[PDB]
A and B are shown apart, each in its own frame.
Chain A
Amino acid sequence: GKVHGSLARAGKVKNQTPKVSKQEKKKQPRGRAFKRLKYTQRYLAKTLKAGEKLRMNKQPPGKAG
């Protein structure tokens, strides 16, 4: 194979990322509580429907609002 290189910069990105914080927030419902929960999340609440199946909206995260 062609394959080329030489150790000179390892660790870098993880190390120069600031390790920020995985921010906390509520413990979820689990098991039945969760599945019941999940359902509502995935479907239906406070709502109407035009026609489309889904999208998540973790787009947006470079949002507009």
Chain B
Amino acid sequence: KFGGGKTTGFGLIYDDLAAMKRIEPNYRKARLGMGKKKLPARKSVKERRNRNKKIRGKAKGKMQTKKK
């Protein structure tokens, strides 16, 4: 922010890459570089979830509601 120029951080050191691979989330991991998390799409198919509790079997992948 304003408070100029300035350079005080805080730092962390990992035992292992495994420990990292488990302690670090992938956007962080990415901030390093080591993997990605789930696909975002601002509740794109959040819609199936709006369909699913009432409905059995069938469906058969990509089954669908308000989005026409």
Contact flag (A, B; Cβ within 8 A): no
A residues contacting B by CB (< 8 A) are: none
B residues contacting A by CB (< 8 A) are: none
